[PDB]
Scaffold this active site. Structure first.
Site, PDB file in Angstrom:
ATOM      1  CG  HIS A  38      -1.953  -1.062   1.212  1.00  0.00           C
ATOM      2  ND1 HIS A  38      -3.187  -0.934   0.614  1.00  0.00           N
ATOM      3  CD2 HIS A  38      -1.923  -2.300   1.753  1.00  0.00           C
ATOM      4  CE1 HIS A  38      -3.874  -2.045   0.788  1.00  0.00           C
ATOM      5  NE2 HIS A  38      -3.129  -2.893   1.475  1.00  0.00           N
ATOM      6  CE  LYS A  55      -5.623  13.115  -0.711  1.00  0.00           C
ATOM      7  NZ  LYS A  55      -6.693  12.810  -1.709  1.00  0.00           N
ATOM      8  NE  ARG A  56      -4.240  10.903   9.437  1.00  0.00           N
ATOM      9  CZ  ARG A  56      -3.962   9.993  10.368  1.00  0.00           C
ATOM     10  NH1 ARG A  56      -4.770   8.956  10.575  1.00  0.00           N
ATOM     11  NH2 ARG A  56      -2.860  10.122  11.098  1.00  0.00           N
ATOM     12  CE  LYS A  89      -2.762  11.072   2.081  1.00  0.00           C
ATOM     13  NZ  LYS A  89      -3.509  10.341   0.977  1.00  0.00           N
ATOM     14  CB  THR A 121     -10.010   4.724  -2.055  1.00  0.00           C
ATOM     15  OG1 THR A 121      -9.763   5.154  -0.719  1.00  0.00           O
ATOM     16  CG2 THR A 121      -9.136   3.509  -2.376  1.00  0.00           C
ATOM     17  CE  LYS A 126     -13.625   6.623   0.203  1.00  0.00           C
ATOM     18  NZ  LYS A 126     -13.134   6.956   1.574  1.00  0.00           N
TER      19      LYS A 126
HETATM   20  O1  LIG Z   1      -4.651   0.915  -0.800  1.00  0.00           O
HETATM   21  C1  LIG Z   1      -5.460   1.765   0.035  1.00  0.00           C
HETATM   22  C2  LIG Z   1      -4.686   3.055   0.291  1.00  0.00           C
HETATM   23  O2  LIG Z   1      -3.586   2.703   1.128  1.00  0.00           O
HETATM   24  C3  LIG Z   1      -2.857   3.868   1.558  1.00  0.00           C
HETATM   25  N1  LIG Z   1      -1.831   3.478   2.504  1.00  0.00           N
HETATM   26  C4  LIG Z   1      -1.938   3.619   3.828  1.00  0.00           C
HETATM   27  S1  LIG Z   1      -3.198   4.334   4.500  1.00  0.00           S
HETATM   28  N2  LIG Z   1      -0.895   3.127   4.531  1.00  0.00           N
HETATM   29  N3  LIG Z   1      -0.842   3.146   5.843  1.00  0.00           N
HETATM   30  C5  LIG Z   1       0.225   2.829   6.444  1.00  0.00           C
HETATM   31  C6  LIG Z   1       0.305   2.841   7.928  1.00  0.00           C
HETATM   32  C7  LIG Z   1       1.535   2.620   8.558  1.00  0.00           C
HETATM   33  C8  LIG Z   1       1.618   2.621   9.953  1.00  0.00           C
HETATM   34  C9  LIG Z   1       0.466   2.839  10.727  1.00  0.00           C
HETATM   35  C10 LIG Z   1       0.540   2.851  12.238  1.00  0.00           C
HETATM   36  F1  LIG Z   1       0.432   4.089  12.686  1.00  0.00           F
HETATM   37  F2  LIG Z   1       1.697   2.348  12.652  1.00  0.00           F
HETATM   38  F3  LIG Z   1      -0.450   2.130  12.733  1.00  0.00           F
HETATM   39  C11 LIG Z   1      -0.759   3.061  10.097  1.00  0.00           C
HETATM   40  C12 LIG Z   1      -0.843   3.061   8.703  1.00  0.00           C
HETATM   41  C13 LIG Z   1      -2.220   4.571   0.354  1.00  0.00           C
HETATM   42  O3  LIG Z   1      -1.409   5.677   0.800  1.00  0.00           O
HETATM   43  C14 LIG Z   1      -3.287   4.979  -0.673  1.00  0.00           C
HETATM   44  O4  LIG Z   1      -2.672   5.500  -1.874  1.00  0.00           O
HETATM   45  C15 LIG Z   1      -4.162   3.751  -0.992  1.00  0.00           C
HETATM   46  O5  LIG Z   1      -5.273   4.172  -1.789  1.00  0.00           O
END
Ligand SMILES: OC[C@H]1O[C@@H](NC(=S)N/N=C/c2ccc(C(F)(F)F)cc2)[C@H](O)[C@@H](O)[C@@H]1O
Ligand SMILES: OC[C@H]1O[C@@H](NC(=S)N/N=C/c2ccc(C(F)(F)F)cc2)[C@H](O)[C@@H](O)[C@@H]1O
Ligand SMILES: OC[C@H]1O[C@@H](NC(=S)N/N=C/c2ccc(C(F)(F)F)cc2)[C@H](O)[C@@H](O)[C@@H]1O
Ligand SMILES: OC[C@H]1O[C@@H](NC(=S)N/N=C/c2ccc(C(F)(F)F)cc2)[C@H](O)[C@@H](O)[C@@H]1O
EC number: 2.4.1.1
Lengths: 810, 810
Positions: free
Chosen positions: B351, B542-543, B548, B650, B654
Site C-alpha cells: 500500500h 484526506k490525512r 499529498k 480511493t 468516491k
Molecule cells: O490501498 C489503500 C490506500 O492505502 C494507503 N496506505 C496507507 S493508508 N498506509 N498506511 C500505512 C500505515 C503505517 C503505519 C500505521 C501505524 F500508525 F503504525 F499504525 C498506520 C498506517 C495509500 O497511501 C493509498 O494510496 C491507498 O489508496
C-alpha cells in the site's frame, strides 16, 4: 414438585419455553446444536429477568409519585452471591422454570451452578448488606443500596500443598445479565487540588476529575411486586485525560483503578491511598445522586424528612464532611443549619471492637487528597470539643480522648469519632456488643449523648437462608403451618406444638439426612473426597481470624485423635469435622492456621486405626454459594470466639434456622440465640466477658494451663516436635510460640470446658430422637433472627418510616 | 419516499414498531417518558440487528456443510464507520424503518446521527478493508476479516486556536450493539521465553501468556442474505497473572494494553514494542482459529486448497514465520513441505512506496519478544539467498540488496522482503503503482520471480458510497436505468446516452444543489459557520501529509486572494475551499500545515473587500461519517499528490461517483480514472513520473521557481514577513524553509500548471450546462472503480475461488 416453589401453569410453562428459545437465538446468537450449558444458563437468566422489568419500572415510578422518605444504605461491600434462584423464588417462578427447562430437556439445578457469585464483600458485614436489601424490598421501603462495582471481588482461594493461594475473581468475564449500565447518569468526582478563600467563602480548585458511572441491579421483594435498586459506581477517565499520545491513553488506567478490586484485608487497617480514594469515590457520587433526586421532589430543612443515610461501618464516614462541604460551599447554607441537617440525616452502625480494625487516616493523606475535607473535619472537631468542655468543665483528659484528631508520631483522624459526632444514631449489632460500646470503647460519647446509642441485633433473610438453600425443610414446615412464615418468621413458634409429633420428628431428621447425602456427594464429585454421611457433621465456616479461634477447634480435633490412638477399640461417635474460610493475603498467622488444618487432615485421614470414625476436611473457597450447600447439611455449628470479640455473627443464625445444634461461647448474637431457645437447648461453654476481664486483670499465663492439663501438653509437644510436619519439624513454631507467650484470645483458658462440652454433644447425638427434638426447639425459636425484624427496627427507631407488607399491582 | 430504499409494507411496518417498543422496554429498561434520543437509537439498532441473526447463523451453517475455500483477510485496521444505515440498506429495510419511526413520532435521520463511528483505522488502507468486506459478502465468498478490537480508535480532532488537539475516541462508552463477545473461543498467545533444542526438534518455553478474546461483528451482503463475520481480538490477562496482592491484580492492565489503542502514526515507522506485540497478537490468535477451523473439515497438503490468507501491508507479516512455526514445531512437518504450504497459502498487498513508512524491525526486539520467530526468519533468509545466488551467480550486491536482514548500526528485518519471499502473489493497488514496484523498489524480486507480481486496482463500495450517502443521485439514476447497477456498477455506462438529455442534466444538477444546501446547513448548525451555497465547492479531504500537497492547494488559495485584492472590482467565480484531515500527533510539519490553513481562513474570511467570493474552511474531525456528508456536496475533487507518491487513492473514486469533477496529477488511480472518462473530461496537470525522475537527476532547485514567478515570490514574502501571523511574524519559518531548501515533493515545480488548470476549472463552472455534461460523463464511467470488480479480480487471480451473485434462502 414441592409446594412452596409455586404454580407450574400450562400458560406460564409454554410462555417461558418460547422466550427461552427466543433468547437463545436473538440474544445469544446460537442454535441448539452449538449451545453449551453456559448458553443455556444465560438464556434462562434473560428469560427470568424479563419478568422484573415492568415491576422495576413501576416501583420507581411509584416512588416518584408518592415521594416517600428515601433510605440510602451506603456500603463498600455487598456480598450478593448468585441471583437466578433468588429471583425465581421472590417472583414465584421456580416450579414453572423447573418444568419449562425439564420439557426443554435440561436440568435447572445444573444451569444454576454455572452462575458466578457476585463476591463484592469479605464476610459478615458484606452479607449483612445483601440480607438487608432483600428485607427492605420485602417490607416495601423506598431503599437504595449504594456501593462500588469492583471488577474483581474477593479472591478465589486455591489450596496448594496445604497452603492458600489467591487468584483473581474475574466475575464479569462472561457478562452480568443482572446489571444495567446507566452511562447517561455519569457524575464527576474530584481529587487533590487546593483550597482558595474568597469573600464569597471557600472554593476547591485545581482538582483532578474521575467520572463515576452507575450500574443498576434490581432487588425484588418477596412476592409483593416491589423491585428496589442497588446502584454500584464504576470509575471512568474523562476524555481529555492526560490530554506522548499513546502513553496519555494508556494512563487512563490510573483513574479507572479506583473500582478495580475489593480490598480483602479484613484483619488490619492499612491506610492505603487507593482505599481512601475508593471511600471518597462512592461517597461523592452517591451524595450528588441523592441531592439530585431530592431537588426533583432551596429548602434543605426538609432534607432529613426526605432522606436517611445509613453508614455501614466507618468506610463511608466521609459522607459527613462531604454533605457539609456541599451544603456550605455550594448551596451556601450557614454552618449551624448545615450541621443540623447533616446530623438528622446520618446514622452509623459499628461492626467491630477490635482496635487494629479501626480506621485512623493519617492527616498528611487527607491533606493531599481531600484538602477541603480536612478543614471541615478540623472545624467539626473544634465545635464538638467546645461542647465537651462545656459539659465536663476542667476534664482535660476527656478532651484528648474524645478528639477526632489523634496526636503522636503521625497525626490521625479517628473516623469512628467523626461518625458519632455527625450522626443522630449509633447502633451496635447485638445486645452485648451494643452494651460493650456504651461501657468501654465509646463510653465518653455515651456519657455526653446517651440518646444516640441503640441496639439493632443482626438477622438473616429466610428467603435465601431457608427457602432457597433448604427447600425440603421449608416444605415439611409449610405442610404443618402454611407458607406465611416465609415473610413473618415469628410464626415458626407454632412448631413447638410438634416437638412430640413422631411424624414431624421423622421428617425433620429425614430432611437433614438427605442434605448430608447431597453434600457428601458434592464433595466426592467436585473434590474427589470420601466422607461417611452417618457421622456427625461438625462445621466451622467463617473468615480465618485468631479471635474466631479455629485454633481451639484444631486442639479438640487432635484431642479426639489422641484418645482414639490411646484406646483404639473403644467406641466413639464418628465425626466429620469441616473447617473453611479465607485468610486475608497479608495475615501470616491466619495462613499458618490453614496450613495446620490441612496438616492435621493429612495425618488423621490416612491413619488405618482411625478408620472412618474421624475425618478432617478443609472446605476450599468458602463463599455465599458454598454456604448455601454446607449449612443445610450441618449437625453442629461452631461459634467459639473469645467472649467479647464477635460483635454479632450471622453464620450462627443460618445454622440455627437450618437444623444444626450450636456449640458456642456467650458472645455476640449467641447470647440472644440461647435466650430465645433456652440454655438447655444450646451447648454453651467457656468464659463469659466478665471472666475474660478478670483474667486480664491478674494477667493471662498460658504456661499455667500447659502445666496442669496433660492432654494439652501432649498436643503442644506433638506440634513442636514435628508430629504433623515430619519433613519440616519446626513448621508450626510460630503457632506454638503465639499460644504459649502471646495469645490475645486465651485459647488455652477455654480448652477444658470446650472438650467437656464436646463430650456432651457426642452423648446427645447417640440418641437421635432427642437430638432431633432439641433441633426442633432451635428452628422453632429462630424467628427473632430474621432480617425483616432487624429492618423493621431500623425503620421505626432510626429512619422514621413505616414498613408495609402490601403488594404493588402486578 | 424514494424507490431504491425498498418497500414499506403494512405487515413489516407494524412488526418493526412493536419490536422497537419491546426493545425500549425489555432491552433498555425505559418507558417513553424517560427515553432520550440515544435510547431511541439503541432501540432501532436492536430492532434492525434482530433481522441479521437468522441470516448470520445460516450463512455460517452453509459454509460448514459446503466447506468452500475460506478467505482470511488480515488487517490491523478496519475503518467501518457507522453500521445502522448500511445494515438497513443491505437488508432492504430503509423505507420500512423510516415509516415505522415516523409513525412512532421520530425522525430516523436524527437517530442515525447518534451512532459513533467505528474508527478502527487511519485512512485509505483501513477504509479499503471495510469496502472489501462489503464486496466479499455481496459476491458470496466465504470470507473473514480478522483484526484487533481497539478500545480507542483514531483520535477525535479538536481545533484549538488554529491548532490540532487530540482526544481519546472512547467509542465503546455506551456499548456496541453490533458485536457479540465470544469468551468461549478465547485463545492463548505467547510472548518472550526462550528456545530449547531437543532430539525431537525446537521448543519455545518460559513464555508469558496473554489471552485473545474474539468479538464477532456481522457483514451483510447486498440483498443476497449472506452475512459474513468480522472477528476482532481483545487482550485479556490470564487469571493466575502476577499470581503484593492488590498490585498483582492492578498489573493485569499491562497484558490488556495490547488492544487498548490504535497507532495513529501513518507517516513514520516507529519500532515500538507495543506495536510489535499488537502485530503478533492478531497473527497468533487468527492462525490458531484458522487451523482449528481447517481441522474440523494431518494432511496439510490440502491446506492451500482450503485456506487463503491475505496480508494487508506488512503489518501482519509475522503470519509467515508463525505458520512455519506451527507447521514445523507443532505438527512436525518437514521444513520444505511446511514452506510449500505457507507460500501457496499467503499473498501480500503493498500500500506504499514511501521509504520512511516501511517496517524494519530491530533484531534485538525480535530476539527478546519472539526468539523462535527470529530463528525461523534467519533460516528463511539463508534458503532464499541460496536461491538468489544460484540464479544470479557472482552477483554479490544483489545478495545484500535482497536480504531480509539489513546490516548497519542496528541490524533490522525487512518485513516487505519477508512478505515477498513467503507469498505466491504480490500486488500493488493501481496500475502505475504496480509498475513502479516492478521497476524500482522490488526490481530485484521481480527479476527473480516475475510470476508473483500482479496489479489489483483499488475500488470503493457503491452501497456506502452512493446509495447510502447520496440517495437522491441513486434514485435519479435508478429512474432511467433500473436498480441493477448497485451490484453491477458497469451498468452506469448506460448513462452516456443521457448526456444530451435536458431533463437528466437538470436532475443531476438539482441533486448536487440540494446536497450543497444540506451541507451548508449542517455547517451553520453544528459549527456556526456561514457559507454561500452558490459558490464552487472546492474540497480536499484526506490525512495531512507532505506528499499529498495540501500546501500546493494553500498556495493557490493565496494566489486567488492576492488577485482579488489587486483587482477588487473584477468578476471571479466564487469558491468555497474546504480542506480537512487529521495529522499524526508526532508529525510537526503536518501540524504546521493545519495551522497555516486556519491562519489563511482567518485573513481571507474577514476581509470586507473579498465579500463572499472566497471562503476557506478547515473541516474538523474528518472521518467516515463526515466523508459521507461532504463528498456528495463537492463540485471539485483535489487529488494533487506529487506523481509517483500516492499508491492509488480511493477518496478520488468516491468523488467521481458522486458528481464532482477532478483536478489531479497523473498519480495512483487518477490515471485509470482519466483513462476511463477521457482526458478531456478531467483536469489533469503537472509533472508525470518521468518528469519527476528527470528533475531529480539534474537536482531540484526551488530558488529557480521563486526567482522566475513573481506571484510565487509574493506569497513567500507574505508567509515570511508575518502577513498571516501578525502577532508571531516568524510562525511559518519552518514551512518557508522547507519549501525553499528541502522539499522532497516539489511543490513549486507544479505551481504554474496548477494555477493555470484552476483557471480552466473556473471557466467551465461559468457554464453550468457544460459543467453538468462533463459530470455526467464522469459518473457514467466510474463503474471500473467498484470494489466488486476489485474483489472479483482477487478471487479469480489470487485466491482461486469463483464469486457468486446467488441469494441464500431467506
Ligand atoms: O490501498 C489503500 C490506500 O492505502 C494507503 N496506505 C496507507 S493508508 N498506509 N498506511 C500505512 C500505515 C503505517 C503505519 C500505521 C501505524 F500508525 F503504525 F499504525 C498506520 C498506517 C495509500 O497511501 C493509498 O494510496 C491507498 O489508496
Ligand atoms: O452483559 C452484557 C451487558 O448488558 C448490558 N445490558 C443491556 S444493554 N440491557 N439490559 C437489560 C436488562 C434487563 C433487565 C434487567 C433486570 F435484571 F431485570 F434488572 C437488567 C438489565 C449492561 O448494561 C452491560 O453492563 C453488560 O455488560
Ligand atoms: O454486622 C455484621 C458482621 O460484621 C462483622 N464485621 C466485619 S465483616 N467487619 N469488616 C471490617 C472490614 C475492614 C476492612 C476491610 C477492607 F479490607 F479494608 F476492605 C474489610 C472489612 C463482624 O465481625 C460480625 O460479628 C458481624 O456479625
Ligand atoms: O453492548 C452490550 C454488550 O452486548 C453483548 N451482546 C449480547 S449479550 N448479545 N448480543 C446479541 C447480538 C445479536 C445480534 C447481533 C448482530 F448485529 F446481528 F450481529 C449482534 C449481537 C456483547 O457481547 C458485548 O460485547 C456488549 O458490550
Amino acid at each position: 414438585q414441592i409446594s412452596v416453589r409455586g404454580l407450574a401453569g400450562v400458560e406460564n410453562v409454554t410462555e417461558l419455553k418460547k422466550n427461552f428459545n427466543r433468547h437463545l437465538h436473538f440474544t445469544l446468537v446460537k442454535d441448539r446444536n452449538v449451545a453449551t450449558p453456559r448458553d443455556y444458563y444465560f438464556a434462562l437468566a434473560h428469560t427470568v429477568r424479563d419478568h422484573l422489568v415492568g415491576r422495576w419500572i413501576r416501583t420507581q415510578q411509584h416512588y416518584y409519585e408518592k415521594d416517600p422518605k428515601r433510605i440510602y444504605y451506603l456500603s463498600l461491600e455487598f456480598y450478593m452471591g448468585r441471583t437466578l434462584q433468588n429471583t425465581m423464588v421472590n417472583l414465584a417462578l421456580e416450579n414453572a422454570c423447573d418444568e419449562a427447562t425439564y420439557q426443554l430437556g435440561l436440568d435447572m439445578e445444573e444451569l444454576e451452578e454455572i452462575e458466578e457469585d457476585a463476591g463484592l464483600g469479605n464476610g459478615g458485614l458484606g452479607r449483612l448488606a445483601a440480607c438487608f436489601l432483600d428485607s427492605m424490598a420485602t417490607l416495601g421501603l423506598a431503599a437504595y443500596g449504594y456501593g462500588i462495582r469492583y471488577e474483581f471481588g474477593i479472591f478465589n482461594q486455591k489450596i496448594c500443598g496445604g497452603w492458600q493461594m489467591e487468584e483473581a475473581d474475574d466475575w464479569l468475564r462472561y457478562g452480568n445479565p443482572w446489571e444495567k449500565a446507566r452511562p447517561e447518569f455519569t457524575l464527576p468526582v474530584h481529587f487533590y487540588g487546593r483550597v482558595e478563600h474568597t469573600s464569597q467563602g471557600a472554593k476547591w480548585v485545581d482538582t483532578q476529575v474521575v467520572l463515576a458511572m452507575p450500574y443498576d441491579t434490581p432487588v425484588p421483594g418477596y412476592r409483593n411486586n416491589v423491585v428496589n435498586t442497588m446502584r454500584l459506581w464504576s470509575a471512568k477517565a474523562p476524555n481529555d485525560f492526560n490530554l506522548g499520545y499513546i502513553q496519555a491513553v494508556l494512563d487512563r488506567n490510573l483513574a479507572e483503578n479506583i473500582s478495580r478490586v475489593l480490598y480483602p484485608n479484613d484483619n488490619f487497617f492499612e491506610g492505603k491511598e487507593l482505599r481512601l480514594k475508593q471511600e471518597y469515590f462512592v461517597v461523592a457520587a452517591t451524595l450528588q445522586d441523592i441531592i439530585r433526586r431530592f431537588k426533583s421532589s432551596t429548602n434543605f430543612d426538609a432534607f432529613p424528612d426526605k432522606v436517611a443515610i445509613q453508614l455501614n461501618d466507618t468506610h463511608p464516614s466521609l459522607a459527613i464532611p462531604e454533605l457539609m462541604r456541599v451544603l456550605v460551599d455550594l448551596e451556601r447554607l450557614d454552618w449551624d443549619k448545615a450541621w443540623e441537617v447533616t446530623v438528622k440525616t446520618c446514622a452509623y452502625t459499628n461492626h467491630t471492637v477490635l482496635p487494629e480494625a479501626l480506621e485512623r487516616w493519617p492527616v498528611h493523606l487527607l491533606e493531599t487528597l481531600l484538602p477541603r475535607h480536612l478543614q471541615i473535619i478540623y472545624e467539626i472537631n473544634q465545635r464538638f470539643l467546645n461542647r465537651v468542655a462545656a459539659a465536663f468543665p476542667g476534664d482535660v483528659d476527656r478532651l484528648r480522648r474524645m478528639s477526632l484528631v489523634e496526636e503522636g508520631a503521625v497525626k490521625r483522624i479517628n473516623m469512628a469519632h467523626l461518625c458519632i459526632a455527625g450522626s443522630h444514631a449509633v447502633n451496635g449489632v447485638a445486645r452485648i456488643h451494643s452494651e460493650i460500646l456504651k461501657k468501654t470503647i465509646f463510653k465518653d460519647f455515651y456519657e455526653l449523648e446517651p440518646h444516640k446509642f441503640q441496639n439493632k441485633t443482626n438477622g438473616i433473610t429466610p428467603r435465601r437462608w431457608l427457602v432457597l438453600c433448604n427447600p425440603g425443610l421449608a416444605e415439611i414446615i409449610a405442610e404443618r403451618i402454611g407458607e406465611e412464615y416465609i415473610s413473618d418468621l415469628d410464626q415458626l413458634r407454632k412448631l413447638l406444638s410438634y416437638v412430640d409429633d413422631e411424624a414431624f420428628i421423622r421428617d425433620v431428621a429425614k430432611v437433614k439426612q438427605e442434605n448430608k447425602l447431597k453434600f457428601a456427594a458434592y464433595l466426592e464429585r467436585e473434590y474427589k473426597v470420601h466422607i461417611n454421611p452417618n457421622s456427625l457433621f461438625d462445621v466451622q465456616v467463617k473468615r480465618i481470624h485468631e479471635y474466631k479461634r479455629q485454633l481451639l477447634n484444631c486442639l479438640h480435633v487432635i484431642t479426639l485423635y489422641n484418645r482414639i490412638k490411646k484406646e483404639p477399640n473403644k467406641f466413639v461417635v464418628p465425626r466429620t469435622v469441616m473447617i473453611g474460610g479465607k485468610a486475608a493475603p497479608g495475615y501470616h498467622m491466619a495462613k499458618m492456621i490453614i496450613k495446620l488444618i490441612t496438616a492435621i487432615g493429612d495425618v488423621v485421614n490416612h491413619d488405618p486405626v482411625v478408620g472412618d470414625r474421624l475425618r478432617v476436611i478443609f472446605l476450599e473457597n468458602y463463599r455465599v454459594s458454598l454456604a448455601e450447600k454446607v449449612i443445610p447439611a450441618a449437625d453442629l455449628s461452631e461459634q467459639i470466639s473469645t467472649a467479647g470479640t464477635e460483635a454479632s455473627g450471622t453464620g450462627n443464625m443460618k445454622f440455627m434456622l437450618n437444623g444444626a445444634l450450636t456449640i458456642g461461647t456467650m458472645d455476640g448474637a449467641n447470647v440472644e440465640m440461647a435466650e430465645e431457645a433456652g440454655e438447655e437447648n444450646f451447648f454453651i461453654f467457656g468464659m463469659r466477658v466478665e471472666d475474660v476481664d478478670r483474667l486480664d486483670q491478674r494477667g493471662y499465663n498460658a504456661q499455667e494451663y500447659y502445666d496442669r492439663i496433660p492432654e494439652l501438653r501432649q498436643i503442644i509437644e506433638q506440634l513442636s516436635s514435628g508430629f504433623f510436619s515430619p519433613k519440616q519439624p519446626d513448621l508450626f513454631k510460630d503457632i506454638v510460640n503465639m499460644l504459649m507467650h502471646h495469645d490475645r484470645f486465651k485459647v488455652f483458658a477455654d480448652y477444658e470446658e470446650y472438650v467437656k462440652c464436646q463430650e456432651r454433644v457426642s452423648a446427645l447425638y447417640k440418641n437421635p430422637r432427642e437430638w432431633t427434638r432439641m433441633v426442633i426447639r432451635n428452628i422453632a425459636t429462630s424467628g427473632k433472627f430474621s432480617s425483616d425484624r432487624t429492618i423493621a427496627q431500623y425503620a421505626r427507631e432510626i429512619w422514621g418510616v413505616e414498613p408495609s407488607r402490601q403488594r404493588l399491582p402486578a
